[PDB]
Design a protein around this ligand. Structure first.
Ligand SMILES: COc1ccc2c(c1)N(C(=O)OC(C)C)[C@@H](CSC)C(=S)N2
Ligand SMILES: [Mn+2]
Lengths: 558, 427
C-alpha cells in the first residue's frame, strides 16, 4: 500500500549478474534467534517471503557476540556489492571543524536505521535475497528478501542521503533558518533559539522524518555536546581532541611508528608546534610492519618536545564569515615549518606544519613558499577563500628571489612580521666574472666501477693540485672539486666547471641539504665575500679545462 | 547529418566507461557564480539534477570568459572527450587550412551558443554529469547532467557540424576569398583584406549568424569605428620566429668567449653545420676569466658566419599529424618568456617568445597563463591542434591560479617540468 519515499532506480554492471554464494549451514541454535529478528522485521516492509523462484543468495550469519541481551543480525554482501553498479560518491571529506560556524544550539539525531526504512527499487530486490537454515534435507527452506536499504550493501550510504535530502526538503523549506547537514548516520540540526524552542523545531522535525517514516532513538530529549565525531571534540566556542595514547615503550616497530606519526600528524592541526621530520625517515629501509628500525638520536627529541605542548590540551575556535582570515608562519627547525590561521589575535581556528620531503636540496625561501602554498590550497577547501599571510621575510629578500628564480610564482600578498628567526639568504653568487680573483679550473672524475676517485684544480696564478678520495661518485666528485677550489681560494674567486650537475646544485643557491658534502660547500660560500661560478663543454679542450681533465685519472696513466 | 528535432545517437569507444574525474575545490565566489549560472540553465531546460545512480562526474570552473561583471561556467570535458570518438565519419575530408596561418587577419568568433539548441541523446547524457562543489564538505555537492550539446564536449560541433555549413554556405558562397575553418568551439575567419574591411566581413558574418539565430557575443568593444589595436584579431602573417642569436662586440672577455663556445656547442645539436675550434683556440692555456682577449682575425669569421648558419631551419619541417605536439616554456629574464614547440626532441616546428609589462599584468602566473593561451592559440591556427605543455610551475600553484587569468574555452593538457638551468640560454 504505502512506501513514502520514491526509489532511486538501480542497476548492476552490464553483462554481470547477482551473487549465488549458497547456504553454508550451522545447527538449529541461532536459527531461532534470527528467525525471531527476521520475523519482527517481516512485518509488512523491511523484508519479504521469497517465493520458490529465488536464484540469488547473500548469506546472513548471526553474530550476537557483538550485542548483549540482543542477537545481532549481520549479513555479508561481499558478492553482491561486487556485482552492483557504482553510485555518485558518498562524500568523505570530514568537514574540518575549523571551518564551522559558531552556533548557540546544536542537536543530533541517529538515523543509521533509516537504511532499513527507504524502499528498494523493486527490480533490484530480486538480488538482496538471504536464506535461513530450516531443518530438513527436502526442498523448502526459509526464504527472505529485502525491501529496504540493507545495511552493508553498496549504495546504501548513497541512496539514503539522497532519499534523506529529498525528505528534509520540505522541513528545510518551511524552516529557512535552521541548518541540517548530515554525516552518514549523524544528523546535526543546528540553530539559534534557546534550547527550548530549539527542541520545538527539533521536535517538529523528528515528527516530520517520522511522517516520512523514520526512526528516532526515543521521544526523548536529544543532544549531548561536546561530541565525539571523527576524532573531534565539539563544544560551541571550541573544538579539539584528547585521545593521546603516546608510547613510552622500549621497542618500537614501524606499525607503532606509523601510529606514532599518524597520531601527532593529527595533533598537528591544533597544537602550536608539533614536529615530525625525523620520525619520518625511519620508514626508510623496511617493508614488514613489525620490524627492527633502530630508533635514532634526534628522533627521541622531537618525540620529547611535543610530549610537552600536549600537556595542556588546546582549543580551536569557529569562523566568522564576516571577518578576514590570517596566517603567519615561523621556521620551527631545519626545514620544518609551522603555521596557524586566526581571525582575531590568539583566537586560532587551526594550525599546521610543513617539511620539504620535496627535492634533495632546497632553501628557506622555496620551502617558505611551498608552505604559503600548502596553506592556501588547504584554506581554500576549509574556508572557501585565501588568508592574509604575515611571514618572517622582507620583500627585498623575497622580491630579489622570485625574480631570479627560474620558476613561476604567485603569493597572495603578505606582510612582514619581524618575529625572528628570519627567512633570509646566506649568499648570492656574483652574477658576473671577477677581476683579480684567481681563476680556478676544476674537476674530479672517478671510474664508474670503483670506490676511489680524485678531484683537483689548475689556476692562472700557476697553482696545480690533486686530492684522492675514498668511496666517491663521478658526479659527487665534481662537487668535491668545486669544494677543493673554495678551500684554497681567497675571499673572492672564480670557478670553472664542466659538471652541469655541480653547476645546477650550487646555482640553485641551496642552504639546507642532506648531501653531507653540498652542506660543506654551502658553508664556504658564506665565508666568501664573492663567488663566480661558470660552466664549459666537457672534453672540449678549452685552455683551462683541457688541463684539469688530463691532470685527472685519464683512464689510467697506462 | 541533420536530424530535425529528433535525437542523434552518440556513443563511447571500445572498452570505455564514463568519466569519473574528480571536481576541484573552488572558492566561495566561483561557487555562487556557478550556482547562479546553473540554476538558470536549469530553468531554461538546458541542464538537470541527478540522483546517485550516476557515478560519473567531469570538472568545472568559473572563469570570466571576459573580465566583465558577468562570470561564466567552463566545463573541462577533456577525459570525457578521449572516451568517445565516432565522428570523423563526418561528411567532409579536408585537412586544416594550410593557408590560414598565412592570412593577414584571423579573427576568432565563438559559436558555442548554437550547441544549446540541439538535444543530446538521452542515453549519453549521463556522461556529462558535473558537480558544483560545496565549501568545506558540509554539503554533498550539487549535481547536474546535460540535455543538449554541451560546449567544449568534443562532439557537439560534430553533431551540429551539418547545420554549420548549412548556415555558413552563403557567406562562404559570396565571400569566397575568406577562409572559414572551425575548431572545437569557435570559428576562425581569415582573409587578407585591409583591417577596416576585414572587420566588416567578420561583422557581416556575425550579423548573418545572428540573423538565423546562432548568437555571437564576440563583439569588439564598439559599433563601427576607425583607429587600430591588439585584440583577438590574430595576425598570422606577422608573428615570426625569435631565433637563437649570438652577441656583438668591442670588450669580449675569456668568460665571454667561453659562454659563447658553450652556446654554439649546443646549437650543434640542432644545426650540426656549426663549427667552433678556431674560436676555441683563443682560450688555449689557463687565463683569467676577466682577462680581455682581442677577437682574432681568423677567429672573427666563425662567430660572424655561424651568425648565418642559425638564420636557416633544419630537417624537421615535418609535422606528423598523428604524433603529439609538445610545447615547452622557459621564463627568461623578466617580463619575458620564451618558448618552442616540437614533436621530437631538438627539432622545433617553431620557437617563439612572449612578454608584456607589469601593469595589472604584475605576476609570473598570469604571465605564464597568458604565454600559454598565446602559444596554444597560435598552434590551433597553424596545425589546428593544441600542444602538450611542460610548464615551469609547481602544480599546486598552477592549479590554484591557472583559472584566475584564463579566458579561452579549451583546456590544453599540461605537465609540470621541474628544471632548466642552461637551456634558459635563449632557446
Ligand atoms: C556542537 O557542534 C557543532 C557546532 C557548530 C557547527 C557544527 C557542529 N557543524 C556540524 O555539522 O558539525 C559537524 C562537524 C559534524 C555545522 C552544522 S550543525 C547545524 C555548523 S553550521 N557548525
Ligand atoms: Mn670533468
Amino acid at each position: 500500500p504505502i512506501s513514502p519515499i520514491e526509489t532511486v532506480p538501480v542497476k548492476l554492471k552490464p553483462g554481470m549478474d547477482g551473487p549465488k554464494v549458497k547456504q553454508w549451514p550451522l545447527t538449529e541454535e541461532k536459527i531461532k534467534a534470527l528467525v525471531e529478528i527476521c520475523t519482527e522485521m517481516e512485518k509488512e516492509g523491511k523484508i519479504s517471503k521469497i517465493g520458490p523462484e529465488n536464484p540469488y543468495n547473500t548469506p546472513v550469519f548471526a553474530i550476537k557476540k557483538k550485542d548483549s541481551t540482543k542477537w545481532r543480525k549481520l549479513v555479508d554482501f561481499r558478492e553482491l556489492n561486487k556485482r552492483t553498479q557504482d553510485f555518485w560518491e558518498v562524500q568523505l571529506g570530514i568537514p574540518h571543524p575549523a571551518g564551522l560556524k559558531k552556533n548557540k544550539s546544536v542537536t543530533v539525531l541517529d538515523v543509521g536505521d533509516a537504511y532499513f526504512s527507504v524502499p528498494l527499487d523493486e527490480d533490484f530486490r530480486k538480488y538482496t535475497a538471504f536464506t535461513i537454515p530450516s531443518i530438513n534435507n527436502e526442498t523448502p527452506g526459509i526464504r527472505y528478501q529485502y525491501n529496504v536499504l540493507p545495511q552493508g550493501w553498496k549504495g546504501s550510504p548513497a541512496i539514503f542521503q539522497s532519499s534523506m535530502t529529498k525528505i528534509l526538503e520540505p522541513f528545510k523549506k518551511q524552516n529557512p533558518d535552521i541548518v541540517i547537514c548530515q554525516y552518514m548516520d549523524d544528523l546535526y540540526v543546528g540553530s539559534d533559539l534557546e534550547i527550548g524552542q530549539h527542541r520545538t523545531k527539533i521536535e517538529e522535525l523528528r515528527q516530520h522524518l517520522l511522517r516520512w517514516g523514520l526512526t528516532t532513538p526515543d521521544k526523548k530529549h536529544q543532544k549531548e555536546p561536546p561530541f565525539l565525531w571523527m576524532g573531534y571534540e565539539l563544544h560551541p566556542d571550541k573544538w579539539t581532541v584528547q585521545p593521546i595514547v603516546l608510547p613510552e615503550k622500549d621497542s618500537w616497530t614501524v606499525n607503532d611508528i606509523q601510529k606514532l606519526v599518524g597520531k601527532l600528524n593529527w595533533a598537528s592541526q591544533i597544537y602550536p608546534g608539533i614536529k615530525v621530520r625525523q620520525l619520518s625517515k625511519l620508514l626508510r629501509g623496511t617493508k614488514a610492519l613489525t620490524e627492527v628500525i633502530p630508533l635514532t638520536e634526534e628522533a627521541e627529541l622531537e618525540l620529547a618536545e611535543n610530549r610537552e605542548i600536549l600537556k595542556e590540551p588546546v582549543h580551536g575556535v569557529y569562523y566568522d564569515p564576516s571577518k578576514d582570515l590570517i596566517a603567519e608562519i615561523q621556521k620551527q627547525g631545519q626545514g620544518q615549518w609551522t603555521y596557524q590561521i586566526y581571525q582575531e589575535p590568539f583566537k586560532n581556528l587551526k594550525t599546521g606544519k610543513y617539511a620539504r620531503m620535496r627535492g634533495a636540496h632546497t632553501n628557506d625561501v622555496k620551502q617558505l613558499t611551498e608552505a604559503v602554498q600548502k596553506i592556501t590550497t588547504e584554506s581554500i577547501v576549509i574556508w572557501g577563500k585565501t588568508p592574509k599571510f604575515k611571514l618572517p621575510i622582507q620583500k627585498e629578500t623575497w622580491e630579489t628571489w622570485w625574480t631570479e628564480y627560474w620558476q613561476a610564482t604567485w603569493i597572495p600578498e603578505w606582510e612582514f612580521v619581524n618575529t625572528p628567526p628570519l627567512v633570509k639568504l646566506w649568499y648570492q653568487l656574483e652574477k658576473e666574472p671577477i677581476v683579480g680573483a684567481e681563476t680556478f679550473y676544476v674537476d674530479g672524475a672517478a671510474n664508474r666501477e670503483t670506490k676511489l676517485g680524485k678531484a683537483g684544480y689548475v689556476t692562472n696564478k700557476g697553482r696545480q693540485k690533486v686530492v684522492p678520495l675514498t668511496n666517491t661518485t663521478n658526479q659527487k666528485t665534481e662537487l668535491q672539486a668545486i669544494y677543493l677550489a673554495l678551500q684554497d681560494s681567497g675571499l673572492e674567486v672564480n670557478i670553472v666547471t664542466d659538471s652541469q650537475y655541480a653547476l645546477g646544485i650550487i646555482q640553485a643557491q641551496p642552504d639546507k641539504s642532506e648531501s653531507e658534502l653540498v652542506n660543506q660547500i654551502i658553508e664556504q660560500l658564506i665565508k666568501k665575500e664573492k663567488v663566480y661560478l661558470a660552466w664549459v663543454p666537457a672534453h672540449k679542450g678549452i685552455g683551462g679545462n683541457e688541463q684539469v681533465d688530463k691532470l685527472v685519472s685519464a683512464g689510467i696513466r697506462k | 547529418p541533420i536530424s530535425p528535432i529528433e535525437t542523434v545517437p552518440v556513443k563511447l569507444k571500445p572498452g570505455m566507461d564514463g568519466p569519473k574525474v574528480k571536481q576541484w575545490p573552488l572558492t566561495e565566489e566561483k561557487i555562487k557564480a556557478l550556482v547562479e549560472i546553473c540554476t538558470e540553465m536549469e530553468k531554461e531546460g538546458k541542464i538537470s539534477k541527478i540522483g546517485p545512480e550516476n557515478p560519473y562526474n567531469t570538472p568545472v570552473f568559473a572563469i570570466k570568459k571576459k573580465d566583465s561583471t558577468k562570470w561564466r561556467k567552463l566545463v573541462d570535458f577533456r577525459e570525457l572527450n578521449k572516451r568517445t570518438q565516432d565522428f570523423w565519419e563526418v561528411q567532409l575530408g579536408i585537412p586544416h587550412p594550410a593557408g590560414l596561418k598565412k592570412n593577414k587577419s584571423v579573427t576568432v568568433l565563438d559559436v558555442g551558443d548554437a550547441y544549446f539548441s540541439v538535444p543530446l541523446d538521452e542515453d549519453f547524457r549521463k556522461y556529462t554529469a558535473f558537480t558544483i562543489p560545496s565549501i568545506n564538505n558540509e554539503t554533498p555537492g550539487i549535481r547536474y547532467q546535460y540535455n543538449v550539446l554541451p560546449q567544449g564536449w568534443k562532439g557537439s560541433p560534430a553533431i551540429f557540424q551539418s547545420s554549420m555549413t548549412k548556415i555558413l554556405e552563403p557567406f562562404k558562397k559570396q565571400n569566397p576569398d575568406i577562409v572559414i575553418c572551425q575548431y572545437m568551439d569557435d570559428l576562425y575567419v581569415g582573409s587578407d583584406l585591409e583591417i577596416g574591411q576585414h572587420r566588416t566581413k567578420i561583422e557581416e558574418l556575425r550579423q548573418h549568424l545572428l540573423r538565423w539565430g546562432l548568437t555571437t557575443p564576440d563583439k569588439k568593444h564598439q559599433k563601427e569605428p576607425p583607429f587600430l589595436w591588439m585584440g583577438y584579431e590574430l595576425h598570422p602573417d606577422k608573428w615570426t620566429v625569435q631565433p637563437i642569436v649570438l652577441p656583438e662586440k668591442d670588450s669580449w672577455t675569456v668568460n665571454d668567449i667561453q659562454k659563447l663556445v658553450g652556446k654554439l656547442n649546443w646549437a650543434s645539436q640542432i644545426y650540426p653545420g656549426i663549427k667552433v675550434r678556431q674560436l676555441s683556440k683563443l682560450l688555449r692555456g689557463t687565463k683569467a676569466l676577466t682577462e680581455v682577449i682581442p677577437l682574432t682575425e681568423e677567429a672573427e669569421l666563425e662567430l660572424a658566419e655561424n651568425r648565418e648558419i642559425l638564420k636557416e631551419p633544419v630537417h624537421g619541417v615535418y609535422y606528423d599529424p598523428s604524433k603529439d605536439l609538445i610545447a615547452e616554456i622557459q621564463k627568461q629574464g623578466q617580463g619575458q618568456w620564451t618558448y618552442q614547440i616540437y614533436q621530437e626532441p631538438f627539432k622545433n616546428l617553431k620557437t617563439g617568445k612572449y612578454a608584456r609589462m607589469r601593469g595589472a599584468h604584475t605576476n609570473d602566473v598570469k604571465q605564464l597563463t597568458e604565454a600559454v593561451q598565446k602559444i596554444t592559440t597560435e598552434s590551433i591556427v597553424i596545425w589546428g591542434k593544441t600542444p602538450k605543455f611542460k610548464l615551469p610551475i609547481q602544480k599546486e600553484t598552477w592549479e590554484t591560479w591557472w583559472t584566475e587569468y584564463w579566458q579561452a574555452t579549451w583546456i590544453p593538457e599540461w605537465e609540470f617540468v621541474n628544471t632548466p638551468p642552461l637551456v634558459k640560454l635563449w632557446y
